[PDB]
Amino acid sequence: PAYRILKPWWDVFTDYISIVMLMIAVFGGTLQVTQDKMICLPCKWVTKDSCNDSTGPTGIKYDLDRHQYNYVDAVCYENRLHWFAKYFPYLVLLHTLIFLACSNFWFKFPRTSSKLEHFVSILLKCFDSPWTTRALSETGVLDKKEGEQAKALFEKVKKFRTHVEEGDIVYRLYMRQTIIKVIKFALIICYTVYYVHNIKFDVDCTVDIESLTGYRTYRCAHPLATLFKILASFYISLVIFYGLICMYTLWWMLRRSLKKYSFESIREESSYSDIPDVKNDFAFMLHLIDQYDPLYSKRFAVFLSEVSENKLRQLNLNNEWTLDKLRQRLTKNAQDKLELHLFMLSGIPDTVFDLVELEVLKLELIPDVTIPPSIAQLTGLKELWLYHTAAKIEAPALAFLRENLRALHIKFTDIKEIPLWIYSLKTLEELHLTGNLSAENNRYIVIDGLRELKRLKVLRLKSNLSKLPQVVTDVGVHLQKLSINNEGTKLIVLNSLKKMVNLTELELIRCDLERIPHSIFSLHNLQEIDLKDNNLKTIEEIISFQHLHRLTCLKLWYNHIAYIPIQIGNLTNLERLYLNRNKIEKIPTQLFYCRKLRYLDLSHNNLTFLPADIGLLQNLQNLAVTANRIEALPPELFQCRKLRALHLGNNVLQSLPSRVGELTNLTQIELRGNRLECLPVELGECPLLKRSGLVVEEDLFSTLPPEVKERLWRADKE
Template sequence: MLSITEACSLNEDQSSFKTLKPWWDVLMDYLVVLMLMVSIFSGTLLIYKDNMLCLPMGDDPPNASAGTKNPAAFSSSDPPTPEPGAAASGSGAARPAPTTSAEPVKGGHSTNLDYQQYIYISRVCYQKALPWYSKYSPYLALMTSLILMVSSNFWFKYPKTSSKIEHFISILRKCFESPWTTKALSETACQNSEEAPRRLKSCPSRVLDRSGDEATSPCSFQGEAPFDMSEASSTTILDRKDGEQAKALFEKIRKFRAHTEDTDLIYKVYVGQTVFKVVKFLLILGYISCFVGSITFKHICKPDIQNLTGYSVFFCTHNLAFIVQKLLITYMVLVCLYGLVGIYTLFWIFSQSLREYSFEKVREESSFSDIPDVKNDFAFLLHMADQYDQLYSKRFAIFLSAVSENKLREMNLNYEWTYEKLRQHVSRDASGRLELQLFMLPGLPRAVFQMIDLEVLKLELIPDVKLPSKISKMSRLTELYLYHCPAKVEHVAFVFLKDHLKVLHIKFTDIDEIPLWVYTLKGLLELHLSGNLSSVNNKVIALESLKELKNLKVLTIKSNLTKIPSTIVDLASHLSKLTIQNDGSKLIILNNLKKMANLRELELHHCELQKIPHAVLNLTSLQTLDLKSNGIQTVEELEGFHHLRRLTCLKLWHNSITFIPPAIGVIQNLEQLFLSHNRIECLPNDLFSLLKLRHLDLSNNLISIIPQGIGQLELLHSFSVSSNKIEALPSQLFKCIKLKALHLGNNKLSCLLAEVGELTYLTSLELKGNSLESLPLEIGLCPLLKKSGLIVEDALFDTLPSDVKERLTEPEFAR
């Protein structure tokens, strides 16, 4: 026997699913349980009590036929009279009349049937005369109840929806119980209290983001929640564990949202199961209503056993007909209620858009203005949760807010990055200044602004950088790096940066990452920009006006420009160095360079220039020209360089120059010439007329002969011809007695002249990669040359006498 408790357990869902069960689903579950109880009770009665009792009839009724029932033919007032001695037994069969009686008893007649014959006839007539719905309707009701139970919870069990639902419920409950949710809502409630206006008035500072001019209160950043985690009361402070759990929740919700907003499978499955339940209700109501009224107590049975019993017609009664009929009527009432609730569910589903969910009310009540609306399965699940308790969606919305997440990250950040930990990351740069570099943090730790001795601050890939007024305490801060860090500053911080910041480095993907307050830093001396400034869809990406940068001396742009930005004209009167490093894009338009008359240093790298730009000839104040890696093949424009009388450094390295024209001699004030990594084969004599030349780099070319005229460069300090094809050195080279560095490596030298000993200032000599068999002994006469400055093969160094080797290895002060 199936107990009621066991039957009810079939309908029990996991307790966690109740969050997604609205009142109609709960009611339908209770109705299904009642239907199960009715069907199980009916089935149990049929198992234990279901029998028929049959008595023979003397004459066949005129309208009766075998296997049919004719209750109208026999009324309760005129039943066929059985033998008085035939009474129903405990098994449902009539007891036979005594055979010893000589006379029939008054009120009846003898049938001459024994007990076993009555049992046999009752069994045959049960199968032959009793309709199927009288025998099996309880079991049919039980089966349909189980189908309705399964269909009610199908979306919880279907593999493609169950995992999403379980994940959603798990996240929803964690969000509901999270201390971070309570903290955020409590701070919001505090903000909306009567004391809020007074607290807002107590915040006089202003915030500057990209506008530089507009000021807003730092207590209410645009698009942010108005609560301040740093001033939270002790009763709502989160410990580190709770903060990490809330941080993990934000990540889970982000992934779950991306996974569920793309499809509406859960919605379709729920709609499908609801439609199925309504259709099933109509079917159940249809067939039960057809036969429930046909279940009767009286039946006529005509079994083909007259040769055995002597009777062909029997009158039978079904002892459970009345109670089965009443139970089926009760079942039908429950089904009707079930169907009405299902119809209401369909009305609720199709009367509103359940695949869109707006947090408008939550945004109004909690002041979280950045909570996004959701759609598809995510929206449908929230609609279902609202039917259980709308507080769930309100608390869940906290974890959809980007501002809330940023505040949490800021709190966790301040827990983790203490002053002591930041001190461990402080180092000294090449200039000996104190430097702190922070990489890929969710925000800027407050402890940074306690480091008042910091001079260089590097921030990289930090999405939410806010520079508060506390930065004004960092009086030694002069250089700031913002690599993919769109920063906001308070007004007090902006005033401080305007006066104290001297060097600013910004790396960006989109030009909007450059804060507009940068263009108003009047005290800035150097600005280094790196990012995309090329044209997109025929729209030029332009910098803002630079005219407010009145003290800017150095401007560096690393981008893929096709023309010189027009905004640099604003700096024409005071800019002294301009560097443009293109990413292989061809710089076509250079007309704006003509207006930079006061420019002293110009660097154009990777700009795909095939020749020296004519615009350079107008820069009469130019001292350094660097055209590295441009693919320049000819330098005939050097003829016009006689106008550049202040030019002292010319860098044409890493190009494709094959010939140096004699016009090189017009640059009489040239002190440094870089021609390395080209294809130069020979050197003109005019090159050695540059008597002021101090540094000459001809390495990585195709030079085979060094002209004798090199001896004229008496002021030459550094000479490099490494990685060429030189076989012999001219003796005049060693008349350049002021040489400090001589690089001759990777050539075809077979010997080194003894005159090398006359280079008394030589500190660096590179000979490695030649065909030398020995070194001259005079090399030991170079007083400043040490073994560390002598770059040569070890085997070749070992050919020197021991006293020479000792002289080269002994410390300089020992000499």
């Protein structure tokens, strides 16, 4: 029943004027039906078709019957009474009906009635929406269903806007009906004022009935002429008022260009300037509603602003992502600490910052993320991961990160989408850049602020470096673990690492060095070196590595070196050795001089056999011989008692030695790809042996008798 909102004051006034005109039409019509008599007396002395007006006085006899008088009255009413004086009430009724039809045509026309009812429904939904009350009172919890209803209302408003704004039918129809009203008012006022003077009390009729009455002309009287005259004057005044109102409406809708709305008061008041102007067929109904009252328009405008939409998105994210759900979603990363991963979420829920036990926060593909000051509520947070997220941070939150942030992992595609406050983290320890720092003709000016971080210990640039940045070389004087990945992109050192004196890890995975750098020799403090996929050819530079007396984890796997140089034996501190996925045809015996090897692995190699000198390495813990043509192993090798893991992947073994049964400290064994058919039964006599440690083929597993298999299976639970 909410049709009155679309009727402005002028429509109400025109409706009331139409009601009054209809009342006077009914009054005049019932008078002209019940009593419309003309009283006609004949003229005996006639000049120019009119009465000539020329004992005691006596009446003049006309010798006319009553029915002759009635016939004369009827004929002079029909012929010589002005049509206006006869049909004034009927013309008034017709004009009032046409006025009402023009007024209500757009309400009754289905094409515009559908749009009007849709607009009224949407406006009333936006009017009684509690989220509108909250938005206007923004200047304490919300129901889960209310947020979903508000989101559905926002979507409904967007669909209504995209369906209605392209029509431009309601405005055109309203303009057309107002113009019809104005032109009809003009025509009716013209003809009514012209013909109102033809309603006279006394008329003269010369109706040419002489064979019936014997008289030529008659002097008539219309006793209802003065009443119809005042009725016509009253109707003329009413039509004048109606036309003035219609002219005001036409001026109102032809001066402000109602096809476009302003939405300026709310933007100047609600501080939400991001409310776009409204196009045609939707600005018009907004203008009409404003003519009713601006309250509905202001309450409706909150569904046209994207700021309110984003606020609703954030509130629904907070309400749906409850604290318990995030707490249950907490996981443990590689470093064995609490981890929370946010992937493709619209934002960071405020319940997340209630997880004071959180230590690492991962953000991936979160759009327009702003880190609120509530991060200070977190205290155990130490690492922040920004995966394709441009984070904007307030002053207190940035101070908290400047005081309580250890590591920062960011991935990016452009230098512009990295945080500009990264260099403000004075307590940062680990920095992991995995983007593209190579900008347009600059020596990596984007990271020129890396000198600010004096607490930096780990740097993991991955941007396909061509020339090592001078800022990185300068900042490496206090760096512990420098890891670089170029994905095979050429990188040149050219006496760059000689400035560092305290570096210990020098991962250069996929840096396309193609040669071992000559500057790595001066880094005596180094302990881990890894050169994976550097397309190296020769590693005969070990003779220069004797300077590194603390080196224990020389890693060179995923490379191509023809043979192991003899200079390996010169170094005796080798504790971890790695040259997997290389093409080395034989292992020199001098390599086995190192008595402290523990994690030696030479897998995926063209090896034929291992020399017996390997058995003097009692300290060996893990060995990988995957993809090697090892026909057999020396019995001296298994004389060791401190072995932990031996991986034998795809090796040509026909038998397994019977002296391996003396191995007790062994933890796990892998025999995948071997063409074995015999397994010693003495292998099962071991203090530590389970299914997980030793995995073999099921058919080969049957070569041992069941009395030990059942016993070990009994203890496999715990």
